Design a binder for these strands. Structure first.
Length: 51
DNA sequence: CAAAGGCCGAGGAATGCGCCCTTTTAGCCTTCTTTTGTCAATGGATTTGTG
Protein backbone atom coordinates (compact mmCIF):
# COMPACT_ATOMS: atom_id res chain seq x y z
CA UNK A 1 0.00 0.00 0.00
CA UNK A 2 1.14 3.61 -0.09
CA UNK A 3 1.66 4.44 3.58
CA UNK A 4 4.38 6.99 4.44
CA UNK A 5 5.90 6.97 0.95
CA UNK A 6 4.90 8.34 -2.43
CA UNK A 7 3.74 4.94 -3.75
CA UNK A 8 2.19 2.29 -4.40
CA UNK A 9 5.11 -0.09 -4.97
CA UNK A 10 4.30 -3.17 -7.00
CA UNK A 11 4.93 -6.83 -6.31
CA UNK A 12 8.07 -7.26 -8.39
CA UNK A 13 9.62 -4.07 -7.04
CA UNK A 14 8.62 -5.03 -3.50
CA UNK A 15 10.02 -8.55 -3.73
CA UNK A 16 13.21 -7.06 -5.15
CA UNK A 17 13.96 -5.67 -1.69
CA UNK A 18 12.96 -9.03 -0.20
CA UNK A 19 14.42 -11.13 -3.04
CA UNK A 20 11.10 -12.87 -3.65
CA UNK A 21 9.71 -13.47 -7.15
CA UNK A 22 6.48 -11.75 -6.11
CA UNK A 23 4.77 -14.99 -5.13
CA UNK A 24 6.15 -15.23 -1.61
CA UNK A 25 5.63 -11.46 -1.43
CA UNK A 26 1.97 -11.97 -2.28
CA UNK A 27 1.82 -14.64 0.43
CA UNK A 28 3.39 -12.32 3.00
CA UNK A 29 0.92 -9.56 2.19
CA UNK A 30 -1.89 -12.11 2.54
CA UNK A 31 -0.58 -13.30 5.90
CA UNK A 32 -0.33 -9.78 7.28
CA UNK A 33 -3.84 -9.00 6.04
CA UNK A 34 -5.15 -12.19 7.64
CA UNK A 35 -3.46 -11.36 10.94
CA UNK A 36 -4.88 -7.84 11.00
CA UNK A 37 -8.20 -9.40 9.99
CA UNK A 38 -8.57 -10.77 13.52
CA UNK A 39 -10.90 -9.12 16.03
CA UNK A 40 -9.16 -7.90 19.21
CA UNK A 41 -6.51 -6.60 16.78
CA UNK A 42 -8.76 -4.54 14.51
CA UNK A 43 -11.78 -3.41 16.54
CA UNK A 44 -10.72 0.22 16.17
CA UNK A 45 -10.08 -0.27 12.45
CA UNK A 46 -13.53 -1.85 12.37
CA UNK A 47 -14.98 1.31 13.88
CA UNK A 48 -13.31 3.29 11.11
CA UNK A 49 -15.50 1.42 8.65
CA UNK A 50 -18.62 3.45 7.90
CA UNK A 51 -21.90 1.73 7.06
C1' DC B 1 -45.52 85.14 -53.13
C1' DA B 2 -46.26 80.41 -49.14
C1' DA B 3 -47.87 75.25 -48.23
C1' DA B 4 -48.59 70.56 -49.00
C1' DG B 5 -46.52 67.20 -50.05
C1' DG B 6 -42.95 64.06 -52.28
C1' DC B 7 -38.23 62.66 -51.10
C1' DC B 8 -34.19 61.26 -48.72
C1' DG B 9 -31.61 60.44 -44.77
C1' DA B 10 -30.25 59.64 -39.91
C1' DG B 11 -31.77 56.30 -35.73
C1' DG B 12 -34.14 52.37 -33.65
C1' DA B 13 -36.58 47.93 -32.18
C1' DA B 14 -36.96 43.29 -33.33
C1' DT B 15 -41.75 38.43 -35.51
C1' DG B 16 -34.80 39.35 -36.64
C1' DC B 17 -30.91 34.19 -37.86
C1' DG B 18 -27.77 30.07 -44.08
C1' DC B 19 -26.85 26.54 -46.73
C1' DC B 20 -24.54 23.11 -49.02
C1' DC B 21 -20.21 20.81 -49.15
C1' DT B 22 -15.23 19.51 -48.23
C1' DT B 23 -11.73 18.38 -44.52
C1' DT B 24 -9.71 17.91 -40.33
C1' DT B 25 -10.15 16.60 -35.21
C1' DA B 26 -11.92 13.95 -31.04
C1' DG B 27 -12.96 10.29 -29.11
C1' DC B 28 -14.94 5.65 -28.71
C1' DC B 29 -14.35 1.03 -29.73
C1' DT B 30 -12.26 -3.09 -30.79
C1' DT B 31 -7.65 -6.22 -30.74
C1' DC B 32 -3.55 -7.27 -29.16
C1' DT B 33 0.98 -7.28 -26.22
C1' DT B 34 2.72 -6.88 -21.47
C1' DT B 35 2.94 -6.02 -16.49
C1' DT B 36 0.67 -7.78 -12.67
C1' DG B 37 -1.93 -10.33 -9.29
C1' DT B 38 -3.14 -15.52 -8.24
C1' DC B 39 -3.56 -20.79 -7.58
C1' DA B 40 -1.25 -25.00 -7.20
C1' DA B 41 3.01 -27.64 -6.51
C1' DT B 42 7.29 -29.14 -4.40
C1' DG B 43 10.85 -29.40 -1.89
C1' DG B 44 13.34 -27.48 2.16
C1' DA B 45 14.76 -25.37 7.05
C1' DT B 46 12.79 -24.80 12.31
C1' DT B 47 9.30 -27.01 15.66
C1' DT B 48 7.75 -31.06 18.05
C1' DG B 49 7.68 -36.26 19.15
C1' DT B 50 9.94 -39.46 20.65
C1' DG B 51 12.72 -42.01 24.78
Amino acid sequence: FGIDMNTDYTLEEVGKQFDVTRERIRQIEAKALRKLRHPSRSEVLRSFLDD
